């Protein structure tokens, strides 16, 4: 059956978001176990994080096979070119809108160090966008 417009389409999206966060969280936690001398705990966090990678990738497989869009950008991700276009769209949103906006709010609320971080990130995502744009030119132009 067609997944478009179903609740299952939404649940694959929110499964993807949670899986993505779980992998990042567990690898961040592992580095604390590392410094404190808990190699078995760190190893378990790393191995379970591989599980969450598998989960996230499986959600994306169903999304792509179903003709659903990228959770992050609402752009198709069927072909490699589409995947690069999805990357460009996300990076563009981040540098032109999201991170500058976060920076302005941080400065206005009295958090200059957080604002500086968001402005670093905006410059980083702009750099990423440019790099991906150069890939798209290669792919689209053969």
Comparing CB distances to Cl ion, the nearer of 38 and 117 is 38
Rounded distance between C-alpha atoms, residue 23 and residue 35, angstroms: 19
3 touches Cl ion by CB under 5 A: no
Annotated binding residue 59: no
Are the beta carbons of 109 and 118 closer than 8 angstroms?
no
| Residues within window 39-78 making contact with Ni ion, judged by CB under 5 A | 52, 55
Q: How far is the CB of 60 from its own copies (least distance, A)?
A: 5
Rounded Cα gap, residues 93 and 121, in angstroms: 12
Which CB sits closer to Cl ion, 41 or 48?
41
Q: Please, what's the b/e burial string for 88-123 (b: 16 or more CB within 10 A of its CB; e: otherwise)?
A: bbbbbebbeebbeebbeebeeeeeeeebeebbebbe
Q: Is residue 53 within the footprint of its own copies (CB under 8 A)?
A: yes
Residue 126 binding Ni ion, by CB under 5 A: no
Touching Cl ion, residues 5-64 (CB under 5 A) = 38, 40-41
Least spacing, CB of residue 82 vs its own copies, in Å: 10
Q: Which residues contact 44 (CB under 8 A, 6 or more apart)?
A: none
Per-residue binder mask for its own copies (CB under 8 A), 70-109, x = binder: xxx----x--x--xx-xx--x---x---xx--x--xx--x
Contact 20, 84 (CB under 8 A): no
Residue 25 tokens read as 């969280």
Binding of residue 123 to its own copies (CB under 8 A): no
Binding-site residues for Fe(3+), in ranges, read: 19, 52, 55, 91, 94, 125, 128
């Amino acid at each position: 059956k067609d997944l478009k417009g179903t609740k299952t389409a939404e649940n694959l999206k929110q499964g993807f978001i949670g899986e993505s966060m779980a992998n990042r969280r567990y690898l961040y936690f592992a580095k604390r176990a590392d410094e404190e001398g808990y190699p078995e705990i760190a190893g378990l966090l790393r191995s379970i994080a591989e599980g969450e990678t598998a989960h996230a990738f499986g959600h994306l497989d169903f999304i792509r096979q179903g003709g659903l869009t990228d959770p992050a950008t609402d752009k198709p991700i069927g072909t490699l070119e589409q995947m690069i276009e999805s990357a460009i769209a996300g990076e563009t949103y981040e540098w032109t809108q999201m991170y500058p906006g976060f920076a302005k709010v941080a400065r206005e609320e009295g958090f200059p160090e957080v604002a500086e971080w968001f402005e670093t990130l905006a410059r980083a995502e702009k750099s990423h966008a440019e790099k991906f744009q150069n890939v798209l030119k290669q792919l689209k132009g053969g």
